[PDB]
Amino acid sequence: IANIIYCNSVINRLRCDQLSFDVPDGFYSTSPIQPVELPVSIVSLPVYHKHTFIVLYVNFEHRRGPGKCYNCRPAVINITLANFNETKGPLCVDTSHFTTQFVDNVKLARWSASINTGNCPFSFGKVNNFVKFGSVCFSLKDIPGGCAMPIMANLVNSKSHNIGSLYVSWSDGDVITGVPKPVEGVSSFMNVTLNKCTKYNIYDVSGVGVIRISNDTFLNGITYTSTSGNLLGFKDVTNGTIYSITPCNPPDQLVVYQQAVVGAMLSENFTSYGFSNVVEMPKFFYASNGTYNCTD
Amino acid sequence: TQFVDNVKLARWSASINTGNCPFSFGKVNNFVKFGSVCFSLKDIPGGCA
Amino acid sequence: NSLNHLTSQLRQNFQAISSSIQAIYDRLDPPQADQQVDRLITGRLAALN
Amino acid sequence: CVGHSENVFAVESGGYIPSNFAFNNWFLLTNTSSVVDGVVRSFQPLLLNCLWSVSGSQFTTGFVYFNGTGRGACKGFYSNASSDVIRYNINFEENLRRGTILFKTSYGAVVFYCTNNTLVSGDAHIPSGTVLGNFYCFVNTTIGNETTSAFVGALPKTVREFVISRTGHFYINGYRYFSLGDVEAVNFNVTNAATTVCTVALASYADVLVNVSQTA
Amino acid sequence: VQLVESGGGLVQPGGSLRLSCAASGFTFSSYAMSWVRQAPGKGLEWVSAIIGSGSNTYYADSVKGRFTISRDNAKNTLYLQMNSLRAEDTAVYYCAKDTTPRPLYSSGWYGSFDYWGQGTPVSV
Amino acid sequence: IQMTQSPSSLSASVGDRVTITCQASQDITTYLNWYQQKPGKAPKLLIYDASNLETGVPSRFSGSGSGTDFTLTISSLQPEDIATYYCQQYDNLFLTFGGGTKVEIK
Ligand SMILES: *[C@@H]1O[C@H](CO)[C@@H](O[C@@H]2O[C@H](CO)[C@@H](O[C@@H]3O[C@H](CO[C@H]4O[C@H](CO)[C@@H](O)[C@H](O)[C@@H]4O)[C@@H](O)[C@H](O[C@H]4O[C@H](CO)[C@@H](O)[C@H](O)[C@@H]4O)[C@@H]3O)[C@H](O)[C@H]2NC(C)=O)[C@H](O)[C@H]1NC(C)=O
Ligand SMILES: *[C@@H]1O[C@H](CO)[C@@H](O[C@@H]2O[C@H](CO)[C@@H](O[C@@H]3O[C@H](CO)[C@@H](O)[C@H](O)[C@@H]3O)[C@H](O)[C@H]2NC(C)=O)[C@H](O)[C@H]1NC(C)=O
Ligand SMILES: *[C@@H]1O[C@H](CO)[C@@H](O[C@@H]2O[C@H](CO)[C@@H](O[C@@H]3O[C@H](CO)[C@@H](O)[C@H](O)[C@@H]3O)[C@H](O)[C@H]2NC(C)=O)[C@H](O)[C@H]1NC(C)=O
Ligand SMILES: *[C@@H]1O[C@H](CO)[C@@H](O[C@@H]2O[C@H](CO)[C@@H](O[C@@H]3O[C@H](CO)[C@@H](O)[C@H](O)[C@@H]3O)[C@H](O)[C@H]2NC(C)=O)[C@H](O)[C@H]1NC(C)=O
Ligand SMILES: *[C@@H]1O[C@H](CO)[C@@H](O[C@@H]2O[C@H](CO)[C@@H](O)[C@H](O)[C@H]2NC(C)=O)[C@H](O)[C@H]1NC(C)=O
Ligand SMILES: *[C@@H]1O[C@H](CO)[C@@H](O)[C@H](O)[C@H]1NC(C)=O
Ligand SMILES: *[C@@H]1O[C@H](CO)[C@@H](O)[C@H](O)[C@H]1NC(C)=O
Ligand SMILES: *[C@@H]1O[C@H](CO)[C@@H](O)[C@H](O)[C@H]1NC(C)=O
Ligand SMILES: *[C@@H]1O[C@H](CO)[C@@H](O)[C@H](O)[C@H]1NC(C)=O
Ligand SMILES: *[C@@H]1O[C@H](CO)[C@@H](O)[C@H](O)[C@H]1NC(C)=O
Ligand SMILES: *[C@@H]1O[C@H](CO)[C@@H](O)[C@H](O)[C@H]1NC(C)=O
Ligand SMILES: *[C@@H]1O[C@H](CO)[C@@H](O)[C@H](O)[C@H]1NC(C)=O
Ligand SMILES: *[C@@H]1O[C@H](CO)[C@@H](O)[C@H](O)[C@H]1NC(C)=O
Ligand SMILES: *[C@@H]1O[C@H](CO)[C@@H](O)[C@H](O)[C@H]1NC(C)=O
Ligand SMILES: *[C@@H]1O[C@H](CO)[C@@H](O)[C@H](O)[C@H]1NC(C)=O
Ligand SMILES: *[C@@H]1O[C@H](CO)[C@@H](O)[C@H](O)[C@H]1NC(C)=O
Numbered sequence: 001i002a003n004i005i006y007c008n009s010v011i012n013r014l015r016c017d018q019l020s021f022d023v024p025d026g027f028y029s030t031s032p033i034q035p036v037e038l039p040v041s042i043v044s045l046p047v048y049h050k051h052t053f054i055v056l057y058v059n060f061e062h063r064r065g066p067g068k069c070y071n072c073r074p075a076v077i078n079i080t081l082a083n084f085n086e087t088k089g090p091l092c093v094d095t096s097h098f099t100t101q102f103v104d105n106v107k108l109a110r111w112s113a114s115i116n117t118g119n120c121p122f123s124f125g126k127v128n129n130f131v132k133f134g135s136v137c138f139s140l141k142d143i144p145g146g147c148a149m150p151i152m153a154n155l156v157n158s159k160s161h162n163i164g165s166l167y168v169s170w171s172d173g174d175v176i177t178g179v180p181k182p183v184e185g186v187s188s189f190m191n192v193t194l195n196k197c198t199k200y201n202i203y204d205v206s207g208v209g210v211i212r213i214s215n216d217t218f219l220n221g222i223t224y225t226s227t228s229g230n231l232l233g234f235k236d237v238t239n240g241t242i243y244s245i246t247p248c249n250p251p252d253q254l255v256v257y258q259q260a261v262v263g264a265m266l267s268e269n270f271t272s273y274g275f276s277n278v279v280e281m282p283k284f285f286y287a288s289n290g291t292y293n294c295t296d
Numbered sequence: 297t298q299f300v301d302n303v304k305l306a307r308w309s310a311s312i313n314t315g316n317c318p319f320s321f322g323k324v325n326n327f328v329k330f331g332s333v334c335f336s337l338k339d340i341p342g343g344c345a
Numbered sequence: 346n347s348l349n350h351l352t353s354q355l356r357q358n359f360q361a362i363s364s365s366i367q368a369i370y371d372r373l374d375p376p377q378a379d380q381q382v383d384r385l386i387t388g389r390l391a392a393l394n
Numbered sequence: 395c396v397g398h399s400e401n402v403f404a405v406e407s408g409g410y411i412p413s414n415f416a417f418n419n420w421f422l423l424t425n426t427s428s429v430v431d432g433v434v435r436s437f438q439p440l441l442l443n444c445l446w447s448v449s450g451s452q453f454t455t456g457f458v459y460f461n462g463t464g465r466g467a468c469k470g471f472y473s474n475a476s477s478d479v480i481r482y483n484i485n486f487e488e489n490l491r492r493g494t495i496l497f498k499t500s501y502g503a504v505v506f507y508c509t510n511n512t513l514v515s516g517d518a519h520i521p522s523g524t525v526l527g528n529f530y531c532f533v534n535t536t537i538g539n540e541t542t543s544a545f546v547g548a549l550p551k552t553v554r555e556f557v558i559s560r561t562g563h564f565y566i567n568g569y570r571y572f573s574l575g576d577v578e579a580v581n582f583n584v585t586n587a588a589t590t591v592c593t594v595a596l597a598s599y600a601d602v603l604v605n606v607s608q609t610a
Numbered sequence: 611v612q613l614v615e616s617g618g619g620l621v622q623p624g625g626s627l628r629l630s631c632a633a634s635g636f637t638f639s640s641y642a643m644s645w646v647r648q649a650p651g652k653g654l655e656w657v658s659a660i661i662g663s664g665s666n667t668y669y670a671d672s673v674k675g676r677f678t679i680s681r682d683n684a685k686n687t688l689y690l691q692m693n694s695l696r697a698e699d700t701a702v703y704y705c706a707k708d709t710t711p712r713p714l715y716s717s718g719w720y721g722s723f724d725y726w727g728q729g730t731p732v733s734v
Numbered sequence: 735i736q737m738t739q740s741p742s743s744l745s746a747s748v749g750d751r752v753t754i755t756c757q758a759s760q761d762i763t764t765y766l767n768w769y770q771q772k773p774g775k776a777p778k779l780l781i782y783d784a785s786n787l788e789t790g791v792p793s794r795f796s797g798s799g800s801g802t803d804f805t806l807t808i809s810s811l812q813p814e815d816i817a818t819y820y821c822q823q824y825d826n827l828f829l830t831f832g833g834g835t836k837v838e839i840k
Contacts, residue, residue, distance in 0.1 A: 045571070048519075048547075049521075049545075064764075070786060103716070105718075106719065107721075109786075112710050113716065114713055116342070117373060117376075121373075123373055123377075125714075149341075182522070188523050206367045207367050208367065218609045219554060220422060220428045220567060220569070220610065222569055227352045228356065229355060237549070238548060653833065654820060654834075655831070656829055656831070668828070670828065671828075704777075709782070719824065720824070721767070721824020724779040729776055
């Protein structure tokens with residue numbers, strides 16, 4: 001090591017991503033850090049609703065007898081899939097909305113159950129994030145052409161053992177979707193926050209942004225998207241009002257001169273980056289420490 | 297890993313193939329790194345044959 | 346022509362589950378989602394070149 | 395219909411729409427997102443088999459089938475072909491909130507309605523999370539002699555156009571809201587009739603290029 | 611693994627009290643919390659418990675209905691709502707940590723507490 | 735579920751093989767843990783699952799039993815062993831504590 005620099009200041013951070021100790025004079029793009037308190041905003045269309053609960057129960061215990069071994073693999077395993085019956089065939093969801101719940105019934109201390117993704121294209125716990133399917137079926141026995149999610153038993157600071165698997169089969173489509181849970185008293189049809197960075201799932205489109213009210217009066221559709229595919233706005237079917245969506249942290253530009261940051265171009269009227277003065281320019285705001293008594 | 301052919305019939309021999317596994321049974325001896333590895337005569341979910 | 350070509354490449358799946366990064370993280374655990382996001386990163390960097 | 399005498403136009407030979415038509419309340423049908431500005435190519439039901447005026451015609455129309463049964467006095471070129479989409483133009487800010495829409499299928503009769511008094515829907519299978527102070531739409535399916543009710547969702551405060559496909563696709567203001575299954579006929583019997591409905595057209599899918607501005 | 615509580619004092623019967631407990635030095639969302647109090651001259655009486663995700667809530671018979679248990683995973687804080695005080699709630703309260711780590715998508719058993727706090731008493 | 739700790743108090747000398755038992759009134763199988771309570775301090779965990787020694791406790795403690803009667807024995811009494819003891823079951827979410835015992839010095 002010859003010398004080091006700490007990526008703590010504005011100028012030092014710009015040197016760390018530029019991977020150089022000297023930054024040539026010019027204009028550099030940058031992005032503010034995203035907040036972490038992101039609320040959840042959900043918009044959905046009211047349709048014929050029936051809710052199915054896919055509940056998986058995992059329970060095991062050590063073989064009771066003359067040997068009180070604890071680190072050994074469990075000997076008795078009892079895995080059930082709620083209303084699953086082997087002779088009836090796989091448990092296929094046949095309603096519009098559903099949720100998946102994992103119930104651990106093991107009482108042994110330091111022992112816990114878990115489920116892995118395996119070769120499936122989705123995780124058992126993440127299906128509740130508005131995932132779309134044309135059909136979905138769950139079974140405790142092998143399903144042809146499906147995928148398997150391994151079930152594991154874990155000991156604290158000790159190696160874990162496989163205790164079975166869950167078999168899932170699916171097809172693409174928009175008839176069945178997975179919702180988190182029917183809480184008694186939450187209007188999941190239209191519950192959004194405004195003027196704050198929030199995570200949204202609006203009409204089956206997920207992203208992070210800011211929602212606001214625009215006077216636009218488009219008559220066609222309920223969802224408006226850009227060429228990139230990103231959602232630019234949506235319409236409330238009960239109101240008639242159209243809301244716009246903006247990214248939380250749009251890029252800015254920093255002016256560097258003689259290894260120092262002298263100004264910044266901004267899209268908002270904030271004295272950002274510690275500058276004490278801000279001026280209004282024809283197509284952006286400009287913030288700097290300048291006194292505007294210069295000519296060169 | 298060691299492969300032992302106990303068949304004694306003339307003109308007969310045993311062999312093992314890679315299948316869908318990302319490594320060969322005999323090639324594991326070439327300093328292959330793993331976090332864990334398990335072998336079994338019955339199907340293992342999320343594994344290879 | 347150059348801008349429209351660059352923006353249209355954002356819709357490509359690049360052999361991934363979806364072109365939307367947030368959609369991947371909403372469906373898979375971080376260990377598996379990272380292997381899917383890397384497909385979008387390499388493909389989109391090629392479009393920039 | 396109503397105004398300029400040309401809102402209802404004379405269908406050109408072959409079912410084409412005149413090149414100077416203002417397309418007022420003629421929306422671009424979409425299943426998902428809607429284009430704001432640009433030029434797009436798509437299969438749209440714009441090849442008209444027959445277009446007739448309802449307001450000022452005194453015929454009142456009644457029931458309309460996808461085949462020629464029930465059609466009104468077509469203005470201009472017309473055909474005895476089978477159609478796949480029926481378009482109901484509905485005027486300035488008018489709302490179907492105070493009427494019903496009848497349907498005929500191969501299994502009986504189906505009626506679509508929207509209401510605020512729970513006494514009119516009969517049963518309602520768990521319509522949770524809704525605001526109890528506003529209207530919601532349901533549907534009665536009569537399998538012959540067996541009557542059954544079901545919840546379908548909600549419709550906007552104002553409807554500018556109605557489009558129904560033979561395969562049951564239900565379009566409002568250019569967006570597909572429901573899917574009622576195969577449908578062989580439809581009736582727009584709503585109060586303030588012959589004034590809420592302006593023009594009715596039977597159309598078929600055709601390959602078109604559309605210059606869309608402000609989603610119109 | 612440090613636990614510290616606050617909100618003790620003297621409250622008239624039937625009022626309200628906002629108890630609190632703070633946790634640090636471990637992944638807070640993976641462990642079920644619990645609330646327990648020791649009456650003067652009595653043993654330990656379990657009050658309430660909360661799952662790591664906060665989805666399931668349990669109470670004792672005397673605790674049931676009077677108080678609500680809540681937790682905030684965004685700041686590693688455990689919250690309790692003392693409502694409808696009686697004279698028998700005069701005791702010292704401890705917040706405990708379960709020993710079994712469970713995934714956030716799973717509900718599970720509890721009962722083997724290993725680490726406790728320091729104890730904030732209340733009077734009524 | 736009711737649990738009884740007996741005796742509520744006992745005195746022993748340095749080196750005695752002290753033993754304490756508590757009943758459960760129900761088939762708890764193996765779901766019990768023991769606690770250490772120094773007055774003026776919060777309790778600490780001694781043995782879980784009725785037989786496992788916690789890593790933070792000296793190996794001079796042992797417990798065993800199955801069904802409804804469970805036992806906790808000390809190999810030899812040391813000067814800091816003087817403290818309150820408690821047994822608690824976790825076979826049910828509405829778990830209960832025992833009557834509590836107060837060991838004493840001689
Ligand atoms: C929203 O999403 C739904 C579901 O996908 C769409 O519904 C499909 O719409 C397409 C429109 O193109 C339909 O396809 C068309 O079917 C028409 C009728 O075909 C039937 O009838 C003929 C006999 O008359 C049979 O031979 C045939 O098998 C069908 O039973 C045809 O008119 C169309 O054919 C024309 O276009 C094709 C293009 O490939 C040409 O090859 C033909 O020569 C001809 O010109 C076409 O096949 C499709 O059937 C609909 N499916 C369902 C399930 O409803 C909605 O349209 C869509 N809405 C929007 C706005 O996007
Ligand atoms: C494997 O574990 C499952 C865990 O679900 C056990 O099934 C559960 O068994 C209990 C006791 O038989 C059932 O409890 C009682 O069921 C009756 C009948 O509905 C009800 O009246 C009682 O209130 C109580 O719930 C429980 O419902 C049942 N649960 C399910 C999902 O089936 C199963 O018995 C265990 N098997 C073995 C061999 O250990
Ligand atoms: C287009 O198809 C429609 C269906 O929506 C036809 O309507 C009805 O079809 C039946 C077919 O036979 C005709 O049935 C007749 O009904 C009378 C009962 O009143 C009975 O007398 C006869 O024995 C026979 O069953 C009925 O005419 C007809 N209904 C109407 C209103 O015409 C419509 O005919 C079809 N036309 C074409 C162009 O295919
Ligand atoms: C697609 O449709 C849009 C909307 O109708 C068309 O844009 C419109 O085009 C006309 C003719 O260029 C514009 O009118 C002209 O406006 C200027 C400024 O007011 C005036 O000096 C001219 O005498 C004439 O009125 C009209 O303003 C413009 N509308 C908008 C909203 O931009 C577009 O041309 C159509 N494109 C195709 C290929 O059909
Ligand atoms: C839709 O179907 C329901 C179910 O039959 C109808 O509800 C009936 O309404 C009448 C009054 O209109 C009541 O006397 C009956 O008791 C209701 N039925 C039941 C089963 O309770 C509803 O009226 C129908 N609506 C329309 C517009 O046809
Ligand atoms: C499975 O279903 C069949 C058919 O209903 C029934 O006879 C059998 O008892 C069921 N078995 C179990 C274990 O539920
Ligand atoms: C929106 O959802 C949040 C979830 O925390 C809930 O607290 C709030 O009350 C909801 N509001 C409406 C109007 O549904
Ligand atoms: C309202 O609408 C007009 C017309 O589009 C637009 O120029 C204006 O910026 C909007 N302003 C407000 C304050 O809503
Ligand atoms: C739009 O809807 C929300 C509730 O969904 C309500 O707060 C708002 O005031 C409504 N605005 C109008 C103009 O109806
Ligand atoms: C920008 O903000 C400054 C400081 O608050 C204010 O005086 C000025 O009027 C604002 N101008 C605009 C155009 O927003
Ligand atoms: C600009 O002036 C303010 C005065 O308070 C100072 O805090 C800030 O650090 C200065 N910035 C630069 C980049 O010189
Ligand atoms: C501006 O610049 C001039 C010329 O360099 C200087 O003398 C003066 O002090 C500055 N300030 C003002 C307010 O003129
Ligand atoms: C349509 O069918 C009717 C009844 O046969 C016939 O009178 C009419 O001339 C037909 N028209 C065309 C344009 O084919
Ligand atoms: C709509 O139903 C609500 C239920 O809260 C009722 O209060 C209201 O009076 C009804 N209104 C109308 C205008 O029919
Ligand atoms: C038809 O009508 C009668 C009227 O009394 C009713 O009892 C019957 O259930 C209905 N049923 C069917 C199956 O169509
Ligand atoms: C037509 O509508 C009127 C007015 O709502 C109603 O009285 C009549 O019963 C309806 N008739 C049919 C056949 O739908």
